[PDB]
Structure 1
Amino acid sequence: TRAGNFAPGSEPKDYLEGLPGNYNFDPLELGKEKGTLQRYREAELIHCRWAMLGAAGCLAVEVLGLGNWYDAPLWAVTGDKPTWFGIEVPFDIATILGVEVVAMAVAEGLRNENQDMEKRLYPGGAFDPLGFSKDPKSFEDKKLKELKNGRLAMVACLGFAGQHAATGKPILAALGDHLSSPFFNNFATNGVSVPGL
């Protein structure tokens, strides 16, 4: 049931067998204990979901031509009216912070109090209104695809952060620079990712 190997010929860890996204990846023997393994599993799942959300925001700000993700929250610094999808919401920044902190507080308070491992990982019910998880085969297929795209998005978020920390150009500008002259425009040409080129 393993979905591949992170290295052909690696030592098969016995504590990652019946889990989605199993590549036998870890060589540091992390999550040997079952409870710590489940805690790291749910932490990875919700971290990758937040990585989905962040990558979606950072890409939809580019493909819609509405600006860049980094100067999007600069509206509070200059104190002008914020814009989202050309709607011009009138809410004040302090009200945004208050409603965000109370909404995320109630969300993570109701989420943490499930007190059962399977629904702490995969709750279902109200959070799954489409109901495509009726059969186990498609359910585990979508589990594998979700975990794969989630690990990819977790890499992508740090990629966006490092790309903006190196150069001030947006994501699409960096993609076009690597498309035009990859040998002349990459992470090794800026001279800041690796010391002394």
Structure 2
Amino acid sequence: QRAGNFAPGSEPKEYLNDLPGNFNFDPLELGKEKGTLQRYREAELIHCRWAMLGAAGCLAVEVLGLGNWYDAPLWAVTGDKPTWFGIEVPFDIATILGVEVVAMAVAEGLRNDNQDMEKRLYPGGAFDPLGFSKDPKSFEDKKLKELKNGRLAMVACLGFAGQHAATGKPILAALGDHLSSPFFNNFATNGVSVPGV
């Protein structure tokens, strides 16, 4: 089931013998032990799934012309109300922090109490109403798509952060500088990304 090799000709790693998304990657032998791998495989899918939603968010704000992902929480210091598609949601800052904690604590706690190692990664029933998981072939194939797309969101959400710190420009504006003058507008010409430029 090996999707490929990150380094063709590299030595096979037996700890990743048959899993979804295997590329024989691990060079630091993290995951040598069998029990820790089940935890990492759980952490990867959840660090994935949170990134994919958060990534489409930052694009959704800028694509639809609403504003920046960075300036979204700035209403608190100014005092104005937040908005969702300019609807003026009324809740206050202390109300968000209270509902978020109690809601996610109920959710995360129920997740940890599963004690079914396969369902801790890939639940069923209510979390998939339409029933794509019934077909084992497409299920096995769609798992590679969940993981390949997810690793793009994670590495790239980091890019939204790193791009912002060196240059305060937003996402789509920072891209336009590459397309307008690629060789001049790069991370090397930031003056902060590389010491000594």
User: What TM-score, normalized by structure 2, do the two folds share?
Assistant: 0.98
Mapping 1:167-182, distance limit 5 Å: 167-182=167-182
Deviating 4+ runs (over 4 angstroms): none
Q: Distance in 1 between matches of 2:77 and 2:131?
A: 43
Residue 117 of structure 1: SS of its match in structure 2? coil
Q: State how many pairs are aligned.
A: 196
What's the CA shift for 1:88? 1.1
Alpha-carbon shift at residue 39 of structure 1 (Å) = 0.2
Structure 1 residue 50, shift from structure 2 partner: 0.8
Shift of 1:130: 1.5
Deviation sequence 1:66-122 (CA, Å, 0-9, x none): 000000110111110110122211111111110011111111001111011100010
RMSD value over aligned CA atoms? 0.8
Question: In the TM superposition, what whole-angstrom CA distance separates every residue of 1:131-150 from its partner, at most 9, and x where no partner exists?
Answer: 11111110011100110011
Partner of 2:47: 47
Deviation at 1:40, TM superposition (A): 0.5
- Return the TM-score normalized by structure 1: 0.98
How many Å apart are 1:17 and its aligned residue? 2.0
Q: Render the CA deviation track for 1:3-52: whole Å, top value 9, x for unaligned.
A: 01101111110111221111111111111111100100000110011111
Structure 1 gaps, min length 5: none
**Percent of aligned positions with the same letter in both sequences?**
97
Rounded to whole Å, the distance in 1 between the matches of 2:124 and 2:34 is 23
Secondary structure of the residue that 2:11 maps to in structure 1?
coil
